Amino acid sequence: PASTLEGPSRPVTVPLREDRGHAVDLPDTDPRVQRRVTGWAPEQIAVALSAAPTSAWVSWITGDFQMGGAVKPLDPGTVGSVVRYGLAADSLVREATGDALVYSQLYPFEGLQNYTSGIIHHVRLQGLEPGTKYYYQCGDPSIPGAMSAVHAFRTMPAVGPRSYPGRIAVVGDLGLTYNTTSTVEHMASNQPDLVLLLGDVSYANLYLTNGTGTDCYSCSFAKSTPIHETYQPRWDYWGRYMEPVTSSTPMMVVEGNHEIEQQIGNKTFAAYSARFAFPSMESESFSPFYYSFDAGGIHFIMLAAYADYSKSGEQYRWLEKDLAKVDRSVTPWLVAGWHAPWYSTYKAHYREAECMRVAMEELLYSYGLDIVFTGHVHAYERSNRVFNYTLDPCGAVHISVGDGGNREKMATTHADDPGRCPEPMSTPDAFMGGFCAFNFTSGPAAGSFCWDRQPDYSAYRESSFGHGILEVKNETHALWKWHRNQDLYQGAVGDEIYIVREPERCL
Ligand SMILES: *[C@@H]1O[C@H](CO)[C@@H](O[C@@H]2O[C@H](CO)[C@@H](O)[C@H](O)[C@H]2NC(C)=O)[C@H](O)[C@H]1NC(C)=O
Ligand SMILES: *[C@@H]1O[C@H](CO)[C@@H](O)[C@H](O)[C@H]1NC(C)=O
Ligand SMILES: *[C@@H]1O[C@H](CO)[C@@H](O)[C@H](O)[C@H]1NC(C)=O
Ligand SMILES: *[C@@H]1O[C@H](CO)[C@@H](O)[C@H](O)[C@H]1NC(C)=O
Ligand SMILES: *[C@@H]1O[C@H](CO)[C@@H](O)[C@H](O)[C@H]1NC(C)=O
Ligand SMILES: *[C@@H]1O[C@H](CO)[C@@H](O)[C@H](O)[C@H]1NC(C)=O
Ligand SMILES: *[C@@H]1O[C@H](CO)[C@@H](O)[C@H](O)[C@H]1NC(C)=O
Ligand SMILES: [Fe+3]
């Protein structure tokens, strides 16, 4: 395996396999997505980190959702939010209480169906030892049968330059197909201590409110529907399917474009904002869309490609303050995640997030950002160290893992493929607006919008589904491994790199 200490590697493109169709969504008859509890018993149980290893969130839903007809939102105050926890399964002597809420998905158009959720609960457990296994039960102890089985998770290790989570899984754009189950099975077999999910979770917005789905909403329904519809039960199916993972392994989610889910009154992000726990208060972002947290000696920043990222905005000011608080002798690694890649070389979404790069890249570079993880593009790509489109030994490694297995088409065409360079005005993200993607003025592609071969800042690209694992070893070395779904033999690795940071050179 190469090391970033060797400098940039000559670009590699893996030849395409013959297309075998789109991934197939799990049906609503799959036992893993059906309601397996009754009454107010907890379902969709999920653990999330707090800003520091000494606290964590436990979340769950009680009660079935309502889809269609005259939905009647539940009163969240009718079911309590209690977690009992402890260091042994038979001694759950600690107790925490939390908050409950519901959300709805409402469309004021004739023929469209409305949805309202079960009661969602979020409870923060305080006073946890780092690096330690906690057993817990959640629910409402005053309702017979309304407590979960005993589950367990391990807190992140203590913050320090020699203290790291063993394995961090990174995925994006999962959806809920049979290929998603392959990604999640591969990931779970690698026993990660933490899962990062870089947006585009359930793909509920590939469905009409009446349950009909498509591989491409724009292709199918963009002209024949009054709004970009969703089928919200796909979120519940996803949460139920994922429970064996999320109830035992902390999972940190950040939003992608498929979470927009616009509804009545121009309300957006309702499901995303309600369903997951985020360390928004603890990291002082006060937003579900971006936040930070420490996991051992790693300071993680989750940024919002779909909230104002301009230099004059709230997110940028929060980011400046967050970075200024980082002590690189305590957390040597600075790692970021967000939905939209800045250096993807696929035709799909080429240069789409350029305005976010122009806004934020220099700030992150000035603080020595080590690694960036993104999703969005349905393929795998790893960059050489790069800053402002220039190979740079102090630039971040950008890795894109939006290849989680959702039913939309794989990204296969490259912008540098003959005749495939998109027209510049077609590239910017419409939801966020702006145009920042000008033709290059230096380097091999000077005067053009694209290269005519794989750009030298792209180390490796492959159109396969999969997931990655980050193994930070010490304050200067981390091992990254990406695994393709179609390889199932023990120890298979699709791409790997030793990432070596040089603080005396770059900070
Ligand atoms: C930091 O971690 C790296 C990777 O585990 C260590 O590098 C290894 O050190 C051993 C002993 O010298 C070698 O056999 C391996 O070949 C090294 N791997 C690589 C990629 O270089 C490194 O020693 C550690 N640095 C510390 C603990 O200060
Ligand atoms: C769905 O909710 C909206 C907003 O309350 C309402 O206008 C609409 O009539 C509802 N549709 C149905 C079928 O109840
Ligand atoms: C998705 O899963 C199906 C069925 O297991 C498989 O045939 C197909 O090759 C997978 N798609 C990719 C891109 O791996
Ligand atoms: C849902 O509505 C669309 C048209 O809006 C229709 O083509 C589709 O067949 C419907 N699906 C069901 C299950 O009714
Ligand atoms: C509608 O919602 C989105 C997301 O908040 C926002 O960007 C947009 O400006 C809003 N449009 C109007 C007319 O308010
Ligand atoms: C990035 O490169 C362009 C073109 O060379 C330059 O004008 C711009 O100032 C650079 N941005 C930063 C933050 O250096
Ligand atoms: C930018 O490059 C494209 C080809 O990639 C070319 O068609 C276009 O005319 C160029 N625009 C400018 C202002 O140079
Ligand atoms: Fe996306």
Author numbering: 2 to 508
Sentences from the paper on this structure:
PAPs that can hydrolyze phytate are known as PAPhy (Dionisio et al., 2011). Here we show the X-ray crystal structure of the b2 isoform of wheat PAPhy induced during germination. In keeping with other HMW PAPs, TAPhy_b2 consists of a smaller fibronectin type III (FN3) non-catalytic N-terminal domain (residues Pro43–Thr156) together with a larger C-terminal MPE domain (residues Arg168–Glu497). The high-resolution crystal structures of the wheat purple acid phytase isoform b2 reported herein provide a straightforward explanation by highlighting the roles of two sequence inserts (PAPhy motifs) relative to a canonical MPE domain in forming phytate-specific substrate specificity pockets.
Crystals grown using glycoengineered recombinant protein diffracted only to low resolution, so the protein was enzymatically partially deglycosylated and repurified before crystallization. The resulting crystals grew in space group H3 and diffracted to 1.42 Å resolution. The refined crystal structure contains a monomer comprising residues Pro2-Leu508 of the 510-residue protein in the asymmetric unit. Four disulfide bonds and seven N-glycosylation sites are present, all according to previous predictions (Dionisio et al., 2011, 2012). A preference for Fe2+ in the MII site of the MPE domain has been described for TaPAPhy_b2 (Dionisio et al., 2011), a feature arising perhaps as a route to cellular redox regulation, and correspondingly two iron ions were modeled in the electron density present at the active site. Anomalous scattering peaks calculated using a dataset collected at the iron K-edge (Fe-SAD) supported this interpretation. X-ray fluorescence spectra combined with absorption edge scans confirmed the absence of manganese. The iron in the MI site is tetrahedrally coordinated by residues Asp174, Tyr204, His379, and Asp201, the latter of which bridges the two metal ions. The iron in the MII site is octahedrally coordinated by Asn258, His340, His377, and the bridging residue Asp201. A phosphate ion is bound to the two metal ions and the side chains of His259, His350, and Glu409.
